[PDB]
Amino acid sequence: AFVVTDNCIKCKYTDCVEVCPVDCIYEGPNFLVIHPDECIDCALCEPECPAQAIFSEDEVPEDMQEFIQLNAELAEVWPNITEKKDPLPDAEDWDGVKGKLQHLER
Ligand code: SF4
Ligand code: F3S
C-alpha cells in the first residue's frame, strides 16, 4: 500500500488522484488518504505529489508510522475522490511545515 503522510495536511493538491488507476483515494476536509486494501502498489502517485507526502508503506519515515494506520482508518469513513480539484487556498504556505497532524480535520 502507498500511504499519504503529514505534508499533505492543509495542502491537498489532489494531483495524486489523476494518476490512480484504481481510484482508491478518499477525501477529507484538508487531507487525502489511500485505501490499503484497494491500492495495487503501482507507485504512479508518489512522483505526482507536489508536497512529496506519499510513500510506499515500507518507506514511511520512522516518525510518521502513525500515518499507515491513519490511512487505513480514515479510508473507511471518508468519501472517494476521483477527480482532481484545486489545492487548498493557502497550500504553499503550509507546504513543508512540520507537525501538521495536529491540524487534521475529520
Ligand atoms: S500506488 Fe497506484 S493504486 Fe496506490 S494510490 Fe498510488 S496511484 Fe493509486
Ligand atoms: S498533497 Fe495530498 S492530495 Fe495527493 S497530491 Fe499530495 S497526497
Instruction: Supply the DSSP symbol for 80.
Output: B
Nearest atom (ligand 2) to Cα of 11:
1
Method: X-ray
Q: Which resolution, in Å, applies to this structure?
A: 2.3
Q: Cβ distance 73 to 22 under 8 Å?
A: no
CATH architecture of 1-106: 2-Layer Sandwich (3.30)
Instruction: Supply the DSSP symbol for 79.
Output: P
Q: Cβ distance 18 to 57 under 8 Å?
A: no
Q: Cβ distance 75 to 22 under 8 Å?
A: no
What is the Cα–Cα distance from 28 to 5, expressed in whole angstroms?
13
| Residue 19 grid cell | 494518476
Q: Cβ distance 61 to 43 under 8 Å?
A: no
Residue nearest to atom 8 of ligand 1 (CA): 20
What is the Cα–Cα distance from 68 to 102, expressed in whole angstroms?
16
What is the Cα–Cα distance from 58 to 76, expressed in whole angstroms?
21
Ligand lying closest to the C-alpha of residue 38: 1
